C-alpha cells in the first residue's frame, strides 16, 4: 500500500505475534509490540526522543497482550491504520511510516492509547518527535 516497507514488515510480525500468543485478532497492541521489537525500527528511537521509556513500554504492552482472549486484523487495527493514512495525508508524507502509528494509536482510545498516555505520550511530544 502506501505503507513503508518497514511498516509492512512490522505488520507481518504483528500477525505472527497474534498467532504465537493464540489471539484471534491482530490488535493495535500487537502492531506496537512488533514495532518496539523492530531492530533499526523508527518507533523505539521516536519514543526515546519524546522522553518515553521504550523499555517499560514493551513490558506494559506485553502485559496487555497477556490479558487478551485466546483461542485476522481486528477492526480496532483497521481503524487505527485508517487514521495513520489520514495523518500521513495531513502531514504531507508520501508514505505512511511507523512513527505515525504511535500518534494515531494515541488518538484512537482503547488499551494502547491508555498505556501510551500513562507512559507520558501526548499528541504534542509525539508530533514533535515525528517532525524532528
Numbering used by the authors: 4 to 74, 82 to 142
Sentences from the paper on this structure:
Heat-shock protein (Hsp) 100 protein complexes are critical cell stress responders that solubilize and unfold toxic protein aggregates and amyloids, thereby enhancing thermal and chemical tolerances. They are members of the conserved family of AAA+ molecular machines that form dynamic hexameric-ring structures and undergo ATP hydrolysis-driven translocation of polypeptide substrates through a central channel. To better elucidate the Hsp100 disaggregation mechanism we determined cryo-EM structures of the ClpB hyperactive variant, K476C, bound to the model substrate, casein. We focused on this variant because of its robust ATPase and disaggregase activity in order to capture active states of translocation.
To characterize the NTD ring in the ClpBK476C:casein structure, particle re-centering and focused classification and refinement was performed. This improved the density for the individual NTDs and connecting NBD1 linker enabling the identification of a trimer NTDs form the channel entrance. NTDs from protomers P1, P3, and P5 were determined to form the NTD ring, which retains the overall spiral architecture of the NBDs. Additional NTD density corresponding to the other protomers (P2, P4, and P6) is not observed, indicating they are likely disconnected and flexible. Remarkably, density corresponding to the polypeptide substrate is identified to extend up from the P5-NBD1 pore loop and directly contact the P5 and P3 NTDs. An additional nine residues were modeled into this substrate density as poly-Ala. Based on the molecular model, NTD-substrate interactions are proposed to involve helix A1, which contacts the substrate approximately two residues above P5-NBD1 pore loop in protomer P3 and ~7 residues above in protomer P5. Interactions are also observed between helix A6 in protomer P3 and the substrate. Surprisingly, we identify the substrate entrance channel comprises of an NTD trimer from alternating protomers (P1–P3–P5). We identify a substrate channel entrance that comprises an NTD trimer which binds substrate as a spiral, extending its unfolded state, thereby facilitating transfer to the AAA+ channel.
